[PDB]
Structures are given as structure tokens and as C-alpha cells.
Amino acid sequence: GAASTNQLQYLQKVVLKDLWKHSFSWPFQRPVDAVKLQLPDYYTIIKNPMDLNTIKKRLENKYYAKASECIEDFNTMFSNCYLYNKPGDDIVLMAQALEKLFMQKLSQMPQEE
């Protein structure tokens, strides 16, 4: 069947790779194991966990019909961090740096019609 939209191809081939390679990506690479990571009440507060590997697998397996739902998963990743943690926390600065890069790469995505 038809390949994914040109925007989803960009998200997979350009955006995901660039965020993964950023030096601050390591907290965001894999699903949060809150017990192992000593994060109390994480699953009570964060009802929709999301991470880069999950997004990667979704892109590789045609989970998304269009780019907006993939963009929303990247945004849930960042928002989960902002909600659970506190202003001034180093992890928040890390998420903010990845999010700034994300916005930069989205601005270079091909335009829809």
C-alpha cells in the first residue's frame, strides 16, 4: 500500500534521529520505569507515558495515519516531564533543549498542501 505521508517520512528519517542524537536525550530514550528510577507517584500523575523508542517503533510500523498524531506524541513526552518535575530541575532544562530542537526541525518539515 501507499507509503506514509511525506511529513511522517520526515519525522521518522530526520526529526526522530536528531532528537535521539542530542546529548540530552538519554532520559527520554526508553519508557520510564518509575520504580527502578525512584520516581514516586509517576504513574498516578502521568497517564500517557511516552518516549522516543516508542515513537520510533510507531513510525516504523505505520501506527500513525498522519503527522499531527506523531507530533502530539513527541509533545506528550515533553509535557510529561514538565508536569511531573519542577521548574529549576535539571531534567526540565534537558526536555526544554530537546523541545527547542524539535521545534527547529518541525519548522524545516515540508509543508502540506
Ligand X SMILES: C=CCOC(=O)C1=C(C)Nc2c(c(=O)[nH]c(=O)n2CC)[C@@H]1c1ccc(C)cc1
81 binds ligand X (CB under 6 A): yes
Q: Is 85 assigned a ligand-binding role in the annotation? A: yes
Minimum distance, C-beta of residue 71 to ligand X, in the bound complex (Å): 19
* Calpha distance 17→25 (Å, rounded): 11
49 binds ligand X (CB under 6 A): no
Return the residues of window 21-40 that contact ligand X according to CB under 6 A.
Answer: 27-28, 32, 37-39
In the 8-state DSSP scheme, what is residue 111? P
Contact stretch for ligand X (CB under 6 A) within 2-10, 60-68, 82-90, 96-104 = 82-90
Residue 51: Cβ within 10 Å count? 18
Return the residues of window 86-105 that contact ligand X according to CB under 6 A.
Answer: 90-91
Angle at 77 between CA 74 and CA 80, to 5 degrees: 145
Q: Which parts of this chain interact with ligand X (CB under 6 A)?
A: 27-28, 32, 37-39, 81, 84-85, 90-91
